[PDB]
């Protein structure tokens, strides 16, 4: 888990360089089991990606 | 009649059938063929081979356009996904892109009931 190692308080939806690490080429959110992220940060990460997708900072899919 | 050069091969690989449609880059159909229309019914229709023949026939349908490059859009779970792309490369087309365009709902609609076979 990068977020516990860095001591991130909350994952920011606007921090797209960070969030791009936790999505596949398809655009799908990567599991915590794969990335090794903590459960609490995975939930923040999910919410962040979903907000970024709403604002069109990330894609929902690789096929819009 | 007039020459497209750069085409798109749309492969609709259902479990029952394969439809191979070749379009221009703006999605206007040039020709098409199907496994069901290539002399394969029932069990034979849902095979990789019948999709290959459908691909080969679709290449013949558009030979008058003189297509060089194809970008390949693959759709559906079917047995004729792979063999169609191989047949097109073998038919002398240059495969530049291969894309999966299989529609996946982000939930939407309730599927049909499970079959009690």
């Amino acid at each position: 888990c990068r977020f516990t190692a860095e001591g991130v308080q909350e994952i920011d939806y606007k921090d797209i360089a960070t969030l791009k690490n936790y999505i596949t080429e398809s655009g799908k959110i990567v599991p915590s089991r794969i990335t090794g992220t903590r459960a609490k940060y995975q939930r923040q990460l999910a919410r962040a990606i979903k907000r970024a997708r709403y604002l069109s900072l990330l894609p929902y899919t690789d096929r819009h | 009649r007039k020459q497209v050069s750069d085409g798109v091969a749309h492969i609709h690989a259902s479990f029952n059938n394969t439809i191979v449609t070749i379009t221009d880059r703006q999605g206007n159909a040039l020709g098409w063929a199907t496994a069901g229309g290539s002399g394969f019914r029932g069990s034979r229709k849902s095979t990789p081979f019948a999709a290959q023949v459908a691909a080969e026939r679709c290449a013949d349908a558009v030979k008058e356009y003189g297509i060089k490059n194809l970008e390949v859009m693959v759709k559906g779970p079917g047995p004729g996904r792979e063999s169609t792309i191989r047949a097109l490369n073998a038919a002398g087309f240059r495969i530049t892109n291969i894309t999966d365009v299989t529609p996946i709902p982000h939930x939407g609609c309730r599927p049909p009931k499970k079959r009690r076979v």
Partner: protein, 55 residues
């Protein structure tokens, strides 16, 4: 799964890269999962069983 084929590369390599990328997205598993409606009871039941066997 979106493969752009690169210069000076066999088709069999380029196509196998497409085959490998479709396995990754799980698009065919996803399609088989959505052929028929699973009731929530059935979905929870299989989820339970998958967890117990892994354990």
């Amino acid at each position: 799964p979106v493969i752009k084929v690169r210069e000076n590369e066999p088709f069999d390599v380029a196509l196998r890269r497409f085959k490998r990328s479709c396995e990754k997205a799980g698009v065919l598993a996803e399609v088989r999962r959505r052929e028929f409606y699973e009731k929530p009871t059935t979905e929870r039941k299989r989820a339970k069983a998958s967890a117990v066997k892994r354990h």
